Amino acid sequence: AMRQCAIYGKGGIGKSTTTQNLVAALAEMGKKVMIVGCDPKADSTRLILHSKAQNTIMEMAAEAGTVEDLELEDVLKAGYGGVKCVESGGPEPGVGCAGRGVITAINFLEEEGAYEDDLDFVFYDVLGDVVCGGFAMPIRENKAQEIYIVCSGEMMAMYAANNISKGIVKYANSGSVRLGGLICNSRNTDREDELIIALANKLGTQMIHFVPRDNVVQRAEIRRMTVIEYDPKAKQADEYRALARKVVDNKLLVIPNPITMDELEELLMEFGI
Amino acid sequence: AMRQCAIYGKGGIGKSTTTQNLVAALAEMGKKVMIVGCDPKADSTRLILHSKAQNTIMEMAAEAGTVEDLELEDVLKAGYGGVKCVESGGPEPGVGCAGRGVITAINFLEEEGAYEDDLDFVFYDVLGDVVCGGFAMPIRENKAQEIYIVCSGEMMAMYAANNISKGIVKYANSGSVRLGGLICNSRNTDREDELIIALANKLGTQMIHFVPRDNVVQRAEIRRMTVIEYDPKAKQADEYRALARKVVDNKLLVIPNPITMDELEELLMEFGI
Numbered sequence: 019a020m021r022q023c024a025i026y027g028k029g030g031i032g033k034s035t036t037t038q039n040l041v042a043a044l045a046e047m048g049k050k051v052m053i054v055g056c057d058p059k060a061d062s063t064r065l066i067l068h069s070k071a072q073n074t075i076m077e078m079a080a081e082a083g084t085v086e087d088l089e090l091e092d093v094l095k096a097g098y099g100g101v102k103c104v105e106s107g108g109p110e111p112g113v114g115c116a117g118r119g120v121i122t123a124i125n126f127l128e129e130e131g132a133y134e135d136d137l138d139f140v141f142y143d144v145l146g147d148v149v150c151g152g153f154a155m156p157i158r159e160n161k162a163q164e165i166y167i168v169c170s171g172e173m174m175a176m177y178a179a180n181n182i183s184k185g186i187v188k189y190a191n192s193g194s195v196r197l198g199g200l201i202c203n204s205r206n207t208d209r210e211d212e213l214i215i216a217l218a219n220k221l222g223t224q225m226i227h228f229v230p231r232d233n234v235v236q237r238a239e240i241r242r243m244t245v246i247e248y249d250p251k252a253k254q255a256d257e258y259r260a261l262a263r264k265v266v267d268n269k270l271l272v273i274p275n276p277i278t279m280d281e282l283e284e285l286l287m288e289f290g291i
Numbered sequence: 292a293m294r295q296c297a298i299y300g301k302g303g304i305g306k307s308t309t310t311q312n313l314v315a316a317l318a319e320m321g322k323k324v325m326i327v328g329c330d331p332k333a334d335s336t337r338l339i340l341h342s343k344a345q346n347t348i349m350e351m352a353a354e355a356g357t358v359e360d361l362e363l364e365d366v367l368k369a370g371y372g373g374v375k376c377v378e379s380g381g382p383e384p385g386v387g388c389a390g391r392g393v394i395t396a397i398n399f400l401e402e403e404g405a406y407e408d409d410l411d412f413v414f415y416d417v418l419g420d421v422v423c424g425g426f427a428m429p430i431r432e433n434k435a436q437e438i439y440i441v442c443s444g445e446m447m448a449m450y451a452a453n454n455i456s457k458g459i460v461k462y463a464n465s466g467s468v469r470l471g472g473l474i475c476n477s478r479n480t481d482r483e484d485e486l487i488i489a490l491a492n493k494l495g496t497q498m499i500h501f502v503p504r505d506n507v508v509q510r511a512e513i514r515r516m517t518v519i520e521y522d523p524k525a526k527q528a529d530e531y532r533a534l535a536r537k538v539v540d541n542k543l544l545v546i547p548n549p550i551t552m553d554e555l556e557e558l559l560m561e562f563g564i
């Protein structure tokens with residue numbers, strides 16, 4: 019078996035930084051992991067690959083002719099800890115549906131046997147500002163059974179978490195996609211941990227980890243590395259190791275209870291944010 | 292004539308706060324303005340209307356039967372300074388295309404004669420994390436001739452500005468949609484104004500105003516008002532008045548020059564962000 023997980027959240031909240039560091043910690047532990055980038059920004063694997071980014075399936079298919087002219091061994095790339103990496107890509111802005119590349123990529127990976135039994139985890143890093151097209155496909159088509167939402171005390175980040183949860187509820191009659199937890203990627207605000215715990219409880223889930231804001235992230239990323247590789251002794255490396263451990267041990271996967279806008283505002287008012 | 296403007300930018304960057312305050316300042320000056328909300332969050336008019344939000348055209352059409360059963364006088368609502376307000380709405384998460392309501396709304400407004408000659412400005416407040424579907428329609432279909440992008444020193448906010456600019460370039464052969472400027476909505480970071488000026492120069496535009504981070508915004512919004520209405524003497528009210536004046540006087544509308552990821556990273560490295 020393998021655990022298929024998707025990391026969702028609003029743009030800029032820390033999906034790719036959190037995913038790549040979490041996965042590096044899992045690889046450091048001895049797990050076999052694949053990351054599938056499902057965000058048009060297409061830099062979801064660069065810290066594993068030590069790279070600028072990664073050429074996308076959409077780009078490589080266009081240069082080869084069709085996606086069938088591609089071979090998996092040409093598309094998947096291995097980096098830190100043997101983690102395997104692939105980017106979906108997507109159409110240029112103003113052209114077609116921004117999520118169309120996700121559908122092409124996941125189908126290609128399935129057909130070509132990328133989901134070999136020896137994998138322990140797959141992580142999809144998915145744009146979450148809209149829940150439609152290819153960005154909804156991991157939920158709609160039962161590709162990621164465990165959804166973890168990166169958020170913060172920012173109202174927009176909490177709204178996004180609630181919106182993603184509404185999408186999970188919409189497809190709960192089929193497949194087995196569930197909300198696994200919230201990950202608070204801190205903005206260094208007071209009581210932020212308490213706020214995200216409260217939100218998770220209202221949704222029916224948990225806050226799986228509170229990730230502190232730490233400048234070591236930027237110093238590692240300037241050098242195209244995870245904190246795990248860049249400075250294994252960093253306090254922030256231990257934070258990502260704690261997040262990885264709790265993801266491994268997590269057994270709570272729920273159909274969430276989306277809340278009203280009044281509930282979100284009350285949370286913010288209460289915790290003095 | 293009227294000036295048709297659209298405010299784009301990544302989620303949570305300050306589009307709705309900036310738009311409603313800018314428009315309040317324009318109304319305070321004696322201009323006649325309409326705001327069209329083009330973000331599924333659907334709270335782009337609440338500070339003009341003193342409201343929780345506004346019921347959307349998609350919602351009202353469903354309750355009436357068809358969009359043709361709606362009357363403009365039932366849909367448009369007037370608030371502070373006589374500013375007229377309408378919300379597009381959109382499908383629930385996981386269902387259909389998140390931007391579909393924008394197409395329905397703009398077409399309804401055009402057909403029903405909402406664009407009366409006495410209007411001086413129309414502002415569309417548009418989700419910008421993806422540039423596709425109804426979110427691209429104001430650009431693709433020549434609805435907003437002047438695009439202003441709210442951003443900040445945040446890398447993701449600058450990436451979004453570059454992405455929106457790529458969409459403008461894509462449709463420059465038809466219609467007359469142009470980039471009018473960048474608005475820096477500050478994160479209280481050092482040299483942020485210099486950084487956004489540099490980005491604007493690389494794109495071929497200008498930074499039309501630097502909006503400071505000021506807690507008076509939250510105090511006004513808790514009370515469902517713009518800063519302009521809440522505390523007309525606030526320093527931040529004068530900031531929005533300066534932004535409004537410069538939008539009124541702006542004559543630079545360009546086909547932008549999108550930059551490479553290396554250029555963005557160099558900007559960030561240079562200004563020590």
Ligand SMILES: Nc1ncnc2c1ncn2[C@@H]1O[C@H](COP(=O)(O)OP(=O)(O)O)[C@@H](O)[C@H]1O
Binds near residue numbers: 031035
């Ligand atoms: N815990 C953290 N501490 C410091 N910086 C962070 C942290 N998490 C993310 N960042 C920074 O935030 C920015 C956006 O993170 P990213 O993972 O790219 O967001 P997303 O993938 O959700 O768009 C990056 O520059 C990253 O270095």
Ligand SMILES: Nc1ncnc2c1ncn2[C@@H]1O[C@H](COP(=O)(O)OP(=O)(O)O)[C@@H](O)[C@H]1O
Binds near residue numbers: 504
């Ligand atoms: N200049 C500012 N100073 C302080 N808070 C701000 C400022 N601009 C925006 N905000 C706050 O940022 C949050 C997001 O702004 P909003 O306009 O809703 O973003 P968007 O419409 O782009 O999603 C709001 O809570 C708003 O009060």
Ligand SMILES: [Mg+2]
Binds near residue numbers: 035061143
């Ligand atoms: Mg990312």
Ligand SMILES: [Mg+2]
Binds near residue numbers: 306308332334335416
């Ligand atoms: Mg808004």
